[PDB]
Amino acid sequence: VPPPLKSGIGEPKKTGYKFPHVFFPYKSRYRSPHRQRWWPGSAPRFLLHSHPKRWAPRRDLSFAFFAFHGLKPFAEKNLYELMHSLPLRGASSYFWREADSDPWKHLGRKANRLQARGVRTQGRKQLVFSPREIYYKRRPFHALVFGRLSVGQLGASPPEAVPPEPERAEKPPDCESKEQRKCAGVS
Amino acid sequence: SSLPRLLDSELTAIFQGAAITVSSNRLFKALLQSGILDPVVEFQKLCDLYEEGRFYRTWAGGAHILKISGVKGLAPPGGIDGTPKHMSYEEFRTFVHAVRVWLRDERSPVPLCDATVRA
Amino acid sequence: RLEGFLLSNLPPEVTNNQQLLSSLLGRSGLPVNSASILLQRSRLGRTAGRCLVLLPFPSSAFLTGEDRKALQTRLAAVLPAGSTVTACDRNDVENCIEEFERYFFLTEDLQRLGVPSNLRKVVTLSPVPPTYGRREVRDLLREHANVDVDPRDIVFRFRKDGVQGDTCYVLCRSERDAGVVLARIQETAVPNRVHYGQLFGCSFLWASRSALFLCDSQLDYLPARSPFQVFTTGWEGDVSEEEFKNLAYQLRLFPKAVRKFSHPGGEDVSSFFLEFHRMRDAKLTMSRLQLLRRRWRIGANTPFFGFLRMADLRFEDDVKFADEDSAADSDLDEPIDY
Amino acid sequence: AFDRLRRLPNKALRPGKCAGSLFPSLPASVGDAPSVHGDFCVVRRADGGFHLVPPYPPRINRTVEPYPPSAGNFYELNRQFKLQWKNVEYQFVPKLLPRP
Amino acid sequence: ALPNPSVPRAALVAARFLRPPGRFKRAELREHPRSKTGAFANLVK
RNA sequence: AGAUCAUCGAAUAUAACGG
RNA sequence: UUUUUUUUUUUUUU
RNA sequence: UUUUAUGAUCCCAGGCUGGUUUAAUAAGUCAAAGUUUAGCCAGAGUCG
RNA sequence: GCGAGAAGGGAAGUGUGUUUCAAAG
RNA sequence: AGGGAUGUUUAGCCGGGAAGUUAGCGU
């Protein structure tokens, strides 16, 4: 059965609807554009169903309860959550996205799609983000971070690192790139 | 030049005095009695402009025919009630404005309504 | 008071001969004090599809009511050819007609000031206003509700095929700060339409938006004729190469451009050109950029990209202009898919 | 027979013809040219674009009763669509189909 | 005003061969929240 | 946009507006 | 006027 | 003032069309008042 | 991001359809 | 004398969205 609908933190109480959509009794193949994404092999809607209201008994309440965001796994920690614990709010640092452990790329119903090449039978140039201005609306998962986006070349070391690039000035300080997953930096 | 401005409040007495909706028969006679339009305007003058202005169609005056007849009223007469359109307050205001200028431009050197002409 | 009429939609066979035109006026009314006419001429010496007639001194024409005007109009409407409009002229519109003729002659001359890179993100547009417009008339606007003293002699207006004032109006600004401020408050504004009888006319909703730009350079006319689908991009970071810098970073994004060009000038911003193979690829690119813009929080109104076009030109010793060519087949390159 | 409940035929959204016109400049046949858009309207999109949109209720036919008897168990009948803007309201709920 | 809202002429001529939406597509617009509504795009105001 | 026979059930007819 | 903002802008007086 | 046996008022039921060959001095040049099988047009709205 | 009533007989008689013409958003 | 001291609420317009509301004829 599908999970019950819940409102995210920072939102007033709303009135639940009686039916999922207008064509509830009559039609069945019609699907709403704002349908929930809970089946394995998908991603949330960011700010629609990612952070639902959290409740627990009085006994379970504690300081550590509030720090759940900052202890999330690597596969679910966003940029906002990552920059919150870093020195200087992660200012004057570098960040990049590692698209190697996505939920849909390992698990899901459509996890065996046919690509243009076929199957994978076997130093990169990944983008680097330099946060300049940081503004937190709804901590620790919400912020308007403005930074300079540039390109950088990876190294030959075992881990993913950035040797002597960024080199080229791509665009002036703009909005963030992605909000799914991010890595650390040299700083 | 220097056309007088018609106050909203003044029109309220005339509209309510002739009596929400009212028929157009009692309003045509009351307009001339008040003398707000000022030769003397005759009764036929207002009727002619009402049809020429295409006000029955614009206002959807023929929608009441389908309520009595139904399907028979859709067809033309030969292929039927003929009552006039009952203008409301809002509707009547517009008409008064339109007819007030149609008489001033009838003798002005520079036409306002229709200045153009086709050969 | 009456001061003359305004003809339009005249055939070419009557505007090119003053004898025939003068004869038609003598029979209807006064001959060519006698009345006077004024024929509009283009920069190349060609006539137009309209003319103007002026009445004699007001001393002999002040006492003229509608009774004498209806008969004159009617009688003078029959003599000319069919498909012709003969409207009256008021005291206010009479002075504006003279400016209309002068704009057509100076159309090419006026499209050089601020067109170059000097004034890039300045130019604006607002094709709301109808033929009723003037430099002076429009000057009062953008001052009582937006606070912006724009230049006077910086107003340009396009024209239709029948040398009629096109509704597309374009304005400029001295500074760049006020540019943004113009396209944020002029949304859904109803100042007025016409000033007749000391009262206002019909309503008209204003709508200002940046949708067109101008450029004049010596190294832009030739490059912009070879490809059929040419793109324009700007608002880039510090100075960059084409093959070594522009190509490499392009891989990150989704430009998908066959070729590229440069735009010198020695400013603090670059602008590289793009090329496509098919119209579908070009079209899809547009969407991509648009989407990306929002993500970056750049701005809706902020110029970021555009589509390059070649302006129509009229040469000499030509029987027919390129724009007036009916046998052109330059539409097959845009396939329709639905 | 007075004040009798009549019935009118149904009519959906008429698709506009490709070969339409904006404004007939002195037409010279005995009829009115069709329209491209027709019933449909063009509005500004959220993402700065132009797209079609279902207009205000297109002549909701109130003369014929609902076909499915089980309509009240899932939908609230006898609805009204009012247009208000600050302290101003207009009377346009009556959706009458005039004669041809 | 009432019949036709403020629609620029540039966007009307281009949108000629645009196919109208289907039955299900119409419900998407009508579904809440109406996030597809643009500037001055309200059907009530 | 113009034009474009009606038929069966046996049958039963003058009706609506203003002084 | 009150919650929501990955659709904006404005603030001076010799 | 308007319709009315060339059917005005008025009660129940039926949605309109095309489909190639087709014998006979009815030798059809379109199957001759009316017969169909892939098909055209067309068929309201609603989460308060 | 795009497509989706592709399973509809509930309404109507002078209507639904057919025929003759027209349509440079 | 520092394990001190200092710090504390920013303002207006317009457009779109959700919940509650869905009373008005005074323009």
Tab-separated table of N, CA and C in Angstrom, chain A residues 19 22-26, chain D residues 68 70-71 73-75:
chain	number	residue	atom	x	y	z
A	19	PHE	N	-10.505	12.220	-2.430
A	19	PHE	CA	-10.090	11.366	-3.530
A	19	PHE	C	-8.742	11.825	-4.059
A	22	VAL	N	-9.737	13.854	-9.649
A	22	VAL	CA	-11.133	14.047	-10.038
A	22	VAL	C	-11.721	12.756	-10.594
A	23	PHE	N	-10.982	12.073	-11.468
A	23	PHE	CA	-11.481	10.862	-12.122
A	23	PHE	C	-11.102	9.636	-11.292
A	24	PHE	N	-11.541	9.654	-10.037
A	24	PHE	CA	-11.274	8.544	-9.131
A	24	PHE	C	-12.202	7.371	-9.430
A	25	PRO	N	-13.529	7.564	-9.421
A	25	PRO	CA	-14.428	6.427	-9.662
A	25	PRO	C	-14.504	6.016	-11.125
A	26	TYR	N	-14.579	6.996	-12.025
A	26	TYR	CA	-14.838	6.718	-13.434
A	26	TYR	C	-13.617	6.129	-14.131
D	68	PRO	N	-24.988	9.618	-14.943
D	68	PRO	CA	-24.719	8.592	-13.929
D	68	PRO	C	-25.485	8.875	-12.649
D	70	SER	N	-25.063	7.670	-9.734
D	70	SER	CA	-24.122	7.746	-8.617
D	70	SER	C	-23.127	8.886	-8.776
D	71	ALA	N	-23.616	10.110	-8.980
D	71	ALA	CA	-22.743	11.269	-9.124
D	71	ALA	C	-22.615	12.070	-7.837
D	73	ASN	N	-22.429	10.859	-4.793
D	73	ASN	CA	-21.586	10.179	-3.819
D	73	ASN	C	-20.109	10.510	-3.983
D	74	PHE	N	-19.720	11.150	-5.088
D	74	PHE	CA	-18.329	11.508	-5.326
D	74	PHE	C	-18.136	12.944	-5.791
D	75	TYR	N	-19.193	13.636	-6.212
D	75	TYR	CA	-19.092	15.011	-6.676
D	75	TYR	C	-20.263	15.812	-6.129
